[PDB]
C-alpha cells in the first residue's frame, strides 16, 4: 500500500496533514515491531525527520521496540530527536 501511494502520484490522494500523520504514525506502529532493526532505523531517518514529527503513540513504540530488540547504542540520538 505504501508502494501504491508512491506509484501513481504521491500527494493528491491524502487530503489533510492530520490524516497524513495518522497514516505515518500507524505505519511506524506496524513497521517497528514487525520488521527488523536494520530496516527500522533506515526508515526512521527517512520518515521521522522529513515527513512528520512524532506524536506520543509513535514516541512510546520505538522505546518499546529497542527494549525488545536489546539495542542500547541507539538511545541518545533518538533522545536528542
Amino acid at each position: 500500500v505504501h508502494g501504491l501511494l508512491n506509484t501513481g502520484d504521491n500527494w493528491k490522494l491524502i487530503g489533510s496533514d492530520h490524516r497524513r500523520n495518522f497514516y505515518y504514525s500507524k505505519f511506524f506502529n506496524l513497521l517497528c515491531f514487525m520488521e527488523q532493526i536494520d530496516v527500522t532505523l533506515k526508515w526512521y531517518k527517512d520518515l521521522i525527520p522529513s515527513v512528520f514529527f512524532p506524536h506520543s503513540q509513535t514516541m512510546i513504540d520505538l522505546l518499546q521496540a529497542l527494549d525488545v530488540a536489546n539495542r542500547l547504542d541507539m538511545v541518545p540520538q533518538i533522545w536528542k530527536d
Partner: protein
C-alpha cells in the same frame, strides 16, 4: 531517393519537466519545500509546521486583499504576454440600475443577489428561467424561513423549469 526524413514528436510544454522530476526524487534530510530550510525557520514540531504554512497562507490572503482593495495601483502591465491571473479582480457590479445585467453580476459574486432580485421585482421586471435559476443556485450555494421564502419566489412568480428548481 536517398532522402530520409524522420518524423517529429509533439509534446506538452511540461512533459520534459516531469521527465526531470522523475529522475529527481525526494530528499531524505530536507524540510518540506514550502517552508524555508534555514535552521531558524525549520519547524520543530507539526504544530509549528501548520503555524508556518497558515502564516504564509494568511500572507497570501492579506496581500490579495490589498490587491482587491486598491486595484488602480496594479493596472499597469509590464509583462507583455499578459498573464490574466496577475491582474486585480473586480468584485463590483458593472451596471447599477439595469436589471438584466445587474442580476447576473450580483449572482456571480447572497445579499447582493437578493438586492438585485428585489430591485428587479420592484420595477415589474420579469426574471426569466435562467436568471431565477442562477439566483436560486447562488442562494443554495451560500445558505431556514428564507429558504421557504425563496421557494415561494421560485414557484409563485414564474413557472420556473424543473431541471433547475428541483435541483
Amino acid at each position: 531517393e536517398e532522402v530520409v526524413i524522420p518524423k517529429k514528436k509533439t509534446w506538452d510544454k511540461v512533459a520534459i519537466l516531469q521527465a526531470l522530476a522523475s529522475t529527481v526524487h525526494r530528499d531524505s534530510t530536507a524540510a518540506p519545500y514550502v517552508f524555508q530550510d534555514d535552521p531558524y525557520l525549520i519547524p520543530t514540531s507539526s504544530v509549528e509546521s501548520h503555524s508556518f504554512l497558515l502564516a504564509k497562507k494568511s500572507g497570501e490572503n492579506a496581500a490579495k486583499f490589498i490587491i482587491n482593495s486598491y486595484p488602480k495601483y496594479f493596472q499597469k502591465d509590464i509583462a507583455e504576454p499578459h498573464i490574466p491571473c496577475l491582474m486585480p479582480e473586480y468584485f463590483e457590479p458593472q451596471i447599477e440600475d439595469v436589471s438584466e445585467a445587474a442580476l447576473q453580476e450580483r449572482i456571480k459574486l447572497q445579499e447582493p443577489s437578493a438586492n438585485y432580485n428585489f430591485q428587479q421585482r420592484e420595477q415589474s421586471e420579469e426574471l426569466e428561467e435562467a436568471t431565477e435559476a442562477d439566483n436560486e443556485k447562488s442562494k443554495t450555494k451560500a445558505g431556514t424561513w428564507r429558504t421557504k421564502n425563496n421557494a415561494e419566489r421560485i414557484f409563485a412568480l414564474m413557472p420556473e423549469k424543473n431541471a433547475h428548481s428541483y435541483c
